[PDB]
């Protein structure tokens, strides 16, 4: 009986930026999903394609944990069939998604007196992201009618802009840390199951 490394993922000191979401592959371990649901820290625990109480009763080949940090109002965009900057150009869930999304406030952990500007998100992209697709290229985006030869200009914008996380800002702008647990049974063998 060896528990999965949920503690490292959820209690990591630093969370990767949303534009390049951190991905962790969990397998060959027993996962105690009941512990996550029992904790009241998580503000949002929307689950798609399965009921949380029955979650420990099903087995999956791999569990992909996608960890990032997004502002309060943009956590809504983390849902199948949703539109927005985070949904389209940063992290796109498939319409047929079998998994859960967990989000909790992290105002004290992230925001500072001067403001936490470390986290940054992608503003522009030529085409909408396919499900579970991540792009970290920083080519100078072109808005059309002129190529800038990779030089910032009027219609040529750098794709990445940094969040301003002030300590006393509104609830909408406060930093919410989000982990998306996607359960995938890729083929016949299954290694992840709940405790007996």
């Amino acid at each position, epitope marked *: 009986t060896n528990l999965c490394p949920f503690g490292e993922v959820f209690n990591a000191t630093r969370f990767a930026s949303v534009y390049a979401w951190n991905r962790k592959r969990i397998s060959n371990c027993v996962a105690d999903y009941s512990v996550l649901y029992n904790s009241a820290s998580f503000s949002t625990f929307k689950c798609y394609g399965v009921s949380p109480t029955k979650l420990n009763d099903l087995c999956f080949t791999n569990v992909y944990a996608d960890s990032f940090v997004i502002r309060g109002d943009e956590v809504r965009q983390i849902a199948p069939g949703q539109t927005g900057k985070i949904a389209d150009y940063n992290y796109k869930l498939p319409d047929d998604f079998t998994g859960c999304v967990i989000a909790w406030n992290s105002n004290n952990l992230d925001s500072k007196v001067g403001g936490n500007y470390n986290y*940054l998100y992608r503003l522009f992209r030529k085409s909408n992201l396919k499900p579970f697709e991540r792009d970290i290229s920083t080519e100078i985006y072109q808005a059309g009618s002129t190529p800038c030869n990779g030089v910032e*200009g*009027f219609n040529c914008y*750098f794709p*990445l*802009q*940094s*969040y301003g996380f002030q300590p006393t800002n509104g609830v909408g702008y406060q930093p919410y840390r989000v982990v998306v647990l996607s359960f995938e049974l890729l083929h016949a063998p299954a290694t992840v199951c709940g405790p007996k």
Partner: antibody, heavy 133, light 108 residues
Framework: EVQLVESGGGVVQPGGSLRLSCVAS????????MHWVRQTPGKGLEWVSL????????FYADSVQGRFTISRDNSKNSLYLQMNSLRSDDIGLYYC??????????????????????????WGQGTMVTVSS | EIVMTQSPATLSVSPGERATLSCRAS??????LAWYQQKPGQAPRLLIH???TRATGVPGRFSGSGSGTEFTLSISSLQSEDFAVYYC??????????FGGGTKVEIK
């Protein structure tokens, strides 16, 4: 075409208060750093106020930094300028604008960030305010 | 902080002739100076974004040139539709943006 329609400006006695509201049609202002630009009749265009994409970082002109306050509402697609204690120098048309994105400081922009591509391609119709007794 | 100055105060030039407008800046701009034209009764519209890159929907007669401290706007041919006031705005890194004085283009 992409449009900007403003309202709320009007004649007022000196020392009064006015609020200007500019509404954006046929596009989104979520990321762009919108400007308020004053064109005094007989004078060239004068940049007055700026707001960031998320509203966190707001800049003002040296003359009107004390009084004017700019806010934005992305959900309602609106820009509000709360003028206070108007002076004789503030008598002129006021234009909404869509400048380039204001990049908050980050790894790529360490010294306080930069304003990239702040050319006003989209201009509103204008709402003239008058400081008259 | 920086000052943008247009050398031509007023250019009364007959239609069908090249027009030259000179814009000078206090600090090195590194080709970040747009141009605007304003006909009476209308809001000024973007004409040339960047030092010389012509903008969308602009006839090819308008051209830009120069870099660094000095920039230039050249009208290849002057028509009855080219009478307006021209301002050379700058969009440098910091947002104390400064416009230009303006040039008066008049008939004959």
């Amino acid at each position: 075409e992409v449009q900007l329609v403003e309202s709320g400006g009007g004649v007022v006695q000196p020392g009064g208060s006015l609020r200007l509201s500019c509404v954006a049609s046929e596009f989104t202002i979520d990321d762009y750093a919108m400007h308020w630009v004053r064109q005094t009749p007989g004078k060239g265009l004068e940049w007055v106020s700026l707001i960031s994409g998320d509203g966190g970082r707001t800049f003002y002109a040296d003359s009107v930094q004390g009084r004017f306050t700019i806010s934005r509402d992305n959900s309602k697609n609106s820009l509000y300028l709360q003028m206070n204690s108007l002076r004789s120098d503030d008598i002129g048309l006021y234009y909404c604008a869509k400048g380039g994105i204001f990049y908050n400081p980050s790894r790529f922009y360490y010294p306080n960030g930069r304003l990239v591509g702040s050319a006003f391609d989209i201009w509103g119709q204008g709402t003239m305010v008058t400081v008259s007794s | 902080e920086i000052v943008m100055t247009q050398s031509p105060a007023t250019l009364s030039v007959s239609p069908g002739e090249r027009a030259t407008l000179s814009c000078r800046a206090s600090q090195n701009i590194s080709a970040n100076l747009a141009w605007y034209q304003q006909k009476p009764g209308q809001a000024p519209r973007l004409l040339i974004h960047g030092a010389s890159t012509r903008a969308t929907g602009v006839p090819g007669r308008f051209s830009g040139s120069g870099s660094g401290t000095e920039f230039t706007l050249s009208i290849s041919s002057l028509q009855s539709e080219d009478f307006a006031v021209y301002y050379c705005q700058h969009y440098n890194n910091w947002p104390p943006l400064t416009f230009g004085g303006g040039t008066k283009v008049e008939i004959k």
